[PDB]
Amino acid sequence: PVKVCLIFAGGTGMNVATKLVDLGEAVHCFDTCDKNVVDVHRSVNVTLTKGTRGAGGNRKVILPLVRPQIPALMDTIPEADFYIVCYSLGGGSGSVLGPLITGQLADRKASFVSFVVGAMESTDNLGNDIDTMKTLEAIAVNKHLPIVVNYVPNTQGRSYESINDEIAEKIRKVVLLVNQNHGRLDVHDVANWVRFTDKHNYLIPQVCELHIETTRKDAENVPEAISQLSLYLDPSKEVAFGTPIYRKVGIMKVDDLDVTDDQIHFVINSVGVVEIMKTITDSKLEMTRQQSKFTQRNPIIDADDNVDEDGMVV
Numbered sequence: 001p002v003k004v005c006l007i008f009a010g011g012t013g014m015n016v017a018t019k020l021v022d023l024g025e026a027v028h029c030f031d032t033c034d035k036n037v038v039d040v041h042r043s044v045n046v047t048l049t050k051g052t053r054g055a056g057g058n059r060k061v062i063l064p065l066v067r068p069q070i071p072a073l074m075d076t077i078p079e080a081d082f083y084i085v086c087y088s089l090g091g092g093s094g095s096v097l098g099p100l101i102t103g104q105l106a107d108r109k110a111s112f113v114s115f116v117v118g119a120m121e122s123t124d125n126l127g128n129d130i131d132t133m134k135t136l137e138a139i140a141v142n143k144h145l146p147i148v149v150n151y152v153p154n155t156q157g158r159s160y161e162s163i164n165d166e167i168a169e170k171i172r173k174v175v176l177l178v179n180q181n182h183g184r185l186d187v188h189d190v191a192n193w194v195r196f197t198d199k200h201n202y203l204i205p206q207v208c209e210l211h212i213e214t215t216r217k218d219a220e221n222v223p224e225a226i227s228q229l230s231l232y233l234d235p236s237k238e239v240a241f242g243t244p245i246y247r248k249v250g251i252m253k254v255d256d257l258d259v260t261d262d263q264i265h266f267v268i269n270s271v272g273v274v275e276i277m278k279t280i281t282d283s284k285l286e287m288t289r290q291q292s293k294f295t296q297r298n299p300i301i302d303a304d305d306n307v308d309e310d311g312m313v314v
């Protein structure tokens, strides 16, 4: 089984994919149309679904069209010791394909994390965010498995180019983490970090946040940490901080040119998902208020107007 499989879905998904082209065969893209297919995508895997050809937008409309086709997509995905799934919560295709695929990985009893974007353009985007987050929490519950995600809100003002750019970087860091070439760091360890419910049975499988941090201080400030996993380049600087239920260390190799940071900390928690939802729901609400506070003029035809079948008023 390959070391890591990288799944992207939808527009955002493939846009983030173009920056990870150098990983070639490890990258698998999926969309409902080719709207976002560029040239650097031939260096990687690409699959589009039938019947759909890129419309919504609408997840309710896309789901039943793509559901039957999932078995087939799964076949285009080899066994892996870890997976990364990436897509937007805001659109219609990524926010369907992604969770559908996520559900299959969970039946592979696989070890995986997800990178998702909070789209913030419209009450469509916002509404979709909520539904997809809700979807992910239902899968967690039904499959009894934490659904671990790095959440990136499209902060007002900031360019998608920029937002995509940091997601790419965070993905590399996870690719490093699971590149199996560390000291003390087992493949079984990594599974136990991200699938903490398998051994910690008193804990509740739910949607969790993944925090990636390059300082000990930054990691400690992650609230109500559940499951930590640290990489050190200088083993001496190793410190056990915070209060996670699960903690595991590995050591990095200096001759590894992947290593671009003195120390990386991968911290899963869940308490912060509440606020994410509060923000998103409050945004939708404030927009929705102005939407239904808008008023239009009365018509400029009335019942004295002779109107034919084509709408002609002569």
Ligand SMILES: Nc1nc2c(ncn2[C@@H]2O[C@H](COP(=O)(O)OP(=O)(O)O)[C@@H](O)[C@H]2O)c(=O)[nH]1
Pocket (backbone or CB within 6 Å): 009, 010, 011, 012, 013, 015, 016, 056, 057, 088, 090, 091, 092, 093, 094, 095, 117, 119, 120, 121, 125, 154, 160, 161, 163, 164
């Ligand atoms: N960060 C980021 N956000 C994007 C990008 N493209 C689109 N968006 C935002 O994400 C939402 C969904 O877009 P898209 O990924 O094309 O949806 P999908 O293909 O139907 O799954 C849009 O409404 C925008 O809010 C991107 O490349 N990066």
Ligand SMILES: [Mg+2]
Pocket (backbone or CB within 6 Å): 010, 011, 035, 054, 091, 093
């Ligand atoms: Mg699209």
